[PDB]
Amino acid sequence: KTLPCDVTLDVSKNHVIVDCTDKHLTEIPGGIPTNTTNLTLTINHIPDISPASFHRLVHLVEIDFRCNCPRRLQIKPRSFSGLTYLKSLYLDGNQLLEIPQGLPPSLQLLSLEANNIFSIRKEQLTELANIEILYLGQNCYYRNPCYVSYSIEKDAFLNLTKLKVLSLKDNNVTTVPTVLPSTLTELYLYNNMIAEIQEDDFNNLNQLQILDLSGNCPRCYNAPFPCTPCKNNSPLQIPVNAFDALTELKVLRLHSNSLQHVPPRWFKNINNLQELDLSQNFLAKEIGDAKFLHFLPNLIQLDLSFNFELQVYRASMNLSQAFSSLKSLKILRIRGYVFKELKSFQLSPLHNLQNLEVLDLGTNFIKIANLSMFKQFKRLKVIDLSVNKISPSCYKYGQTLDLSKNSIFFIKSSDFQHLSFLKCLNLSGNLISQTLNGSEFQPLAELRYLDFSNNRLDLLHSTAFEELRKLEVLDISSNSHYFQSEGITHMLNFTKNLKVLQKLMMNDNDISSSTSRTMESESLRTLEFRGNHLDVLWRDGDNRYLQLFKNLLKLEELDISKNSLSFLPSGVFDGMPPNLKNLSLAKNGLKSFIWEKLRYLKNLETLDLSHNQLTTVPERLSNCSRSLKNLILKNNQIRSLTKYFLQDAFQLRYLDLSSNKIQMIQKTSFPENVLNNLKMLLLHHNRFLCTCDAVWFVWWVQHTEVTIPYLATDVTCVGPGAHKGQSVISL
């Protein structure tokens, strides 16, 4: 089948999926199966649509036709009336001026985003009486302007009795389109120019659950996007008796509305509100009072970020006592509340929130913060202490103290006292210049993850991190400052004292010398050593560091890549861990990789040599390794394989030679006896010349079921002559 689009079959789901994503077709291809259900026609060069485009396809329930656009796109009349079983259609980014007509009554979803439709009338919506979801957003804003306000005729959406989802974002709307259908459940009116809300705007939405009114009359100070604030810097005028009929409301986003007060009368009728967004407002004084929090006992999320007032640097964080009424609160982000010093009793209202897990306090420029005050927030899961200026992922491991990008330049044992419950500690970006001695992280008895990346660490002692008995993952990446120095001791055998260490990231360290001859660990299984200098360590005639990873008995993941290795000295594979399982040598510069030495690795399965400068493939992979399964030779320089490349290599299950200079592949090197089990195989972006010398290649590539991606677009033919750019399956 010469279809250039992927096909997926789910007989239980009776769905046949044909997707042509980013394939640059100029017309709908012929031969599309009649039993397809999901059709994708995203970014492409399709000129227009016609009734013959979907002539014989009656079992279609989905058409994805997003962002296809010399001029705009035109749709013929009765272009979709023959799609009786149609249920969803995307027409986003097509520069359509008006809603297409003739759509089947069975249509359930319709997306018209990023178009030029700025006028909505009842007559054009008469055919959408059974629609469920309508996406009419992004029709008039700074990225795609229309220079006029959105026009809604009276009761345009009223007769859409089945409508539940309606998004009118980024549409230059001035007033709420009354009257909306009573069956609405999600209303997205955010990022518009609606300046006032009427009391008769939401009388009939009794089933509404999500209401987004974000960006109307926005806070435009230092805004990286074109936004027009309201007149006289007024907030979005919402009456007190506006959210009356909203009884099933669960999400209410009021982000960036320049709000100064939040009346408690707004939350009088919405009993089951779960998420409330109030970011980018002027509620810094309201946070001190926060009377409206007493009407939200079921609130789950509360975003109050970036509510600071300009030219004011507060001495303290003024949280109200009404924050204790948030019984069900879990996530509380109060970023952008810039203030000087964080004290112990400023978080007193949150001391009894049993369901509180995340406490975000980043981007506040906090200077003084006693970390011992967090011994009361042990039940929490994330304690965010981000880019603020405090001076002396991990979420799966337990309690997390994210101290990244602070002003900590040295570590004291007393600073981390009363923090034994910590399971992770993120110290990334602090630029700590310290020679570790094994006593800094003493109170961190239960620490399991320690992030020390983007710092200045000095491995002068092998007793570094010795007191982290329960540490499992250690990240000391991007500490290249002291490792770049030559002649000072670099004790790389500091991992011997770590009894339960499992993973070690120490990459991008520019390590070129080591006093310690070997690295020792009886529990390490993953070690990333990329972006370093093993060429000097494995220099010609230098056998000192050949067995650098031999003593890592349990090591199963070695990531020595980007290490400027022009060649591997003969003998390094003898000094490799016995239990090495997956290996990576990507982006190294490897000129010649010897293959018969791979027999010493009797457990390797995923040798990775992507983005290398190799030239020759092994003579016989079976004689090389008896367990290698997942070869990755992407972006290599290979011109032709061996006559018996995959002979007797039954254990292979993955192969990758994409982006090479290969010319021809014959049968005797690729027997089907092996190819029947290959789960994956890549041979695209290479230099196949499609002459008559590859009759078997032509026959096999278009008649086997071996998975080869991009078999009709990216894997082309270089010759001869008129056969330039030919598809390997079109031969």
Ligand X SMILES: *[C@@H]1O[C@H](CO)[C@@H](O[C@@H]2O[C@H](CO)[C@@H](O)[C@H](O)[C@H]2NC(C)=O)[C@H](O)[C@H]1NC(C)=O
Annotated binding site for guanosine: 365, 389, 458, 489
Residue 36 Cβ vs a copy of itself, minimum distance, rounded to whole Å? 40
Size of the site for a copy of itself (CB under 8 A): 30
User: Is residue 170 near a copy of itself by the rule CB under 8 A?
Assistant: no
Interaction between residue 47 and ligand JRI (CB under 6 A): no
DSSP string, 276-332: EE--SSSTHHHHHH-GGGGG-TT--EEE--S-PPTT--BSS----GGGGG-TT--EE
Q: Which CB sits closer to ligand X, 64 or 605?
A: 64
Q: Which residues of 582-601 are buried (b: 16+ CB within 10 A; e: fewer)?
A: bbbbbbbebeebebebbebb
Closest to ligand X by CB, 470 vs 723, is 470
Shortest CB 178 distance to ligand X, Å: 20
Which parts of 619-648 interact with ligand NAG (CB under 6 A)?
Answer: 630
Is 516 a binder of ligand NAG (CB under 6 A)?
yes
8 A C-beta contact, residue 719 and residue 692: no
Q: How far is the CB of 94 from a copy of itself (least distance, A)?
A: 23
Q: What letter represents residue 649's amino acid?
A: A
Minimum Å distance from CB 314 to a copy of itself? Answer: 12
CA distance 115 to 117: 6
Given candidates 29, 33, 229, 336, which one binds ligand NAG under the rule CB under 6 A? Answer: 33
CB closer to ligand NAG out of 258 and 462 = 462
**Interior CA angle at 446 toward 442 and 449, to 5°?**
95
Report the chain's C-alpha Rg in angstroms.
32
Q: Under the criterion CB under 8 A, does residue 221 sit at the interface with a copy of itself?
A: yes
Q: Where does this chain touch ligand JRI (CB under 6 A) — which range of 85-93, 111-119, 273-281, 426-434? A: 426-434
For 381-432, the three-class secondary structure string (H helix, E strand, C coil) is CEEECCCCCCCCCHHHCCCEEECCCCCCCCCCCCCCCCCCCCCEEECCCCCC
* Structure token pair of residue 460: 């002068």
Query: Residue 281 or residue 659: which is nearer to ligand JRI going by CB?
Result: 281
Q: Name which of ligand NAG, a copy of itself, ligand JRI, none residue 387 binds, using a CB cut-off of 5 to 8 Å depending on partner kind.
A: ligand JRI
Distances in Å between the Cα of 36 and the Cα atoms of 7, 33, 53, 245 are 9, 6, 14, 43
The token pair that represents 589 in the structure block: 């510069």
Distance CA 711, CA 623 (A): 31
**d(Cα 21, Cα 23) in Å, to the nearest integer?**
6
Contact pick of 508, 520, 535, 559 for ligand NAG (by CB under 6 A): 520
Q: Which amino acid is at 652?
A: L
Binding-site partner at residue 412 among a copy of itself, ligand NAG, ligand X, none, CB < 5 to 8 Å by type: a copy of itself
For residue 179, cis peptide bond before it (omega within 30 degrees of 0): yes
User: Taking the chain, what is the end-to-end CA distance rounded to the nearest angstrom?
Assistant: 12
Does residue 387 belong to the site contacting ligand JRI (CB under 6 A)?
yes
Instruction: Copy the structure tokens of residue 121.
Output: 């009338």
Nearer to a copy of itself, 391 or 642 (CB): 391
Which residues in the 298-337 window bind a copy of itself by CB under 8 A? Answer: 310-311, 313
Distance separating alpha carbons of residues 609 and 636, to the nearest angstrom: 8
Q: Does position 370 bind ligand NAG by CB under 6 A?
A: yes
| Residue 496 partner contact from ligand X, ligand NAG, ligand JRI, none using kind-dependent CB cut-offs of 5 to 8 Å | ligand NAG
Specify binding-site residues. Answer: 365, 389, 458, 489
Q: Is 318 in the site for ligand JRI (CB under 6 A)?
A: no
Work out whether 338 is an interface residue with ligand JRI (CB under 6 A). Answer: yes
Of 70 and 487, nearer to ligand X (C-beta) is 487
Distances (CA, A) of 110 to 58, 64, 66, 125: 18, 10, 11, 12
Given the rule CB under 6 A, which residues bind ligand JRI? Answer: 308, 310-313, 336, 338, 363, 387, 409-410, 431, 433-434
Given the rule CB under 8 A, which residues bind a copy of itself? Answer: 142, 221-226, 310-311, 313, 338, 365, 367, 389, 391-392, 407, 409-410, 412, 433-435, 458, 481-482, 485-488
